[PDB]
């Protein structure tokens, strides 16, 4: 049995998909709500915002998870590794996980909009401030992550993105991992650090309003047979019946009482 016939845990279907997180989880009516739209003729440039800070030359990435919503790809944040400073932020947050959200079609995916225009798909780097020591303290924090958004647009392929793609025949169903050590997430970034940066949220259930959102400028192009493979994951665990997993976005939500800002202008 599918989930829509045996359990209404969260997900992406018309049963369980984003309409119905908040009977569960009603801060998904909340002030700083993720993803939004990016106006970008009424995102406001701010000269105190400073250039964002990468540092992942030592970062240790460790293994790829189908968690059943997505994949994501772990890394060790017992030291500051892999850690984003600068830019918006007054503080060190280590990298815990990548993920992506996709679509079905390449018209879809993501979950930031630029002026209402969606990419096939987003990247999450997820990281918490080191200050709360771990990342379940900092979920609990105004605070306490800092995501860096970076759209897919389809046309070239990206190499540094070729090793994800590769490994997918091994996580095809929920609950697999595989190894995925010495991979350098340095090569899934743009040339430019340019961004836009609000208050938000998790995009997933908890929906925990947690999060320093800071979202590049310039997308990465990916190939479509890149972006076609991740639609050849499963949502289902092995011996379920069959849910391509693709369309695991959320759409945009109300801006509230919220102004983005540009590093850039
Ligand atoms: C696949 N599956 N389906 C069911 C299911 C039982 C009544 C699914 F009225 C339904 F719509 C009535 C039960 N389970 C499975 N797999 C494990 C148990
Ligand atoms: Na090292
Ligand atoms: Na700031
Ligand atoms: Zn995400």
């Given at each position: 049995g599918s989930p829509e016939f045996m359990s209404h845990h969260w997900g992406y279907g018309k049963h369980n998909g984003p309409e119905h997180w908040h009977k569960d989880f009603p801060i998904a009516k909340g002030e700083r709500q993720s993803p939004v739209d990016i106006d970008t003729?009424?995102?406001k440039y701010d000269?105190?915002?400073?250039?964002?800070?990468?540092s992942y030359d030592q970062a240790t990435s460790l293994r790829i998870l189908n968690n059943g919503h997505a994949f994501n790809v772990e890394f060790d944040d017992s030291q500051d590794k892999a850690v984003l400073?600068?830019?918006?932020?007054d503080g060190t947050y280590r990298l815990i996980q990548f993920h992506f959200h996709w679509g079905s079609l390449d018209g879809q995916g993501s979950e930031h909009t630029?002026?209402?225009?969606?990419?096939?798909?987003?990247?999450?780097l997820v990281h918490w401030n080191t200050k709360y020591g771990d990342f379940?303290?900092?979920?609990?924090?105004?605070?306490?992550?800092?995501?860096?958004?970076?759209?897919?647009?389809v046309g070239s392929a990206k190499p540094g993105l070729?090793?994800?793609?590769?490994?997918?025949?091994?996580?095809?169903?929920?609950?697999?991992?595989?190894?995925?050590?010495?991979?350098?997430?340095?090569?899934?970034?743009?040339?430019?650090?340019?961004?836009?940066?609000?208050?938000?949220?998790?995009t997933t259930p908890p929906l925990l309003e947690c999060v320093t959102?800071?979202?590049?400028?310039?997308?990465?192009?990916?190939?479509?047979?890149?972006?076609?493979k991740f639609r050849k994951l499963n949502f289902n665990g092995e011996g379920e019946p069959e849910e391509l997993m693709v369309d695991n976005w959320r759409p945009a939500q109300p801006l509230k009482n919220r102004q983005i800002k540009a590093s850039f202008k």
């Open positions: 003729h009424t995102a000269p105190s915002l400073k250039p964002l800070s990468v400073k600068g830019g918006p932020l630029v002026d209402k225009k969606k990419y096939a798909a987003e990247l999450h379940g303290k900092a979920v609990q924090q105004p605070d306490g992550l800092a995501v860096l958004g970076i759209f897919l647009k070729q090793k994800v793609v590769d490994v997918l025949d091994s996580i095809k169903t929920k609950g697999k991992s595989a190894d995925f050590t010495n991979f350098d997430p340095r090569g899934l970034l743009p040339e430019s650090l340019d961004y836009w940066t609000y208050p938000g949220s998790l959102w800071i979202v590049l400028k310039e997308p990465i192009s990916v190939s479509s047979e890149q972006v076609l």
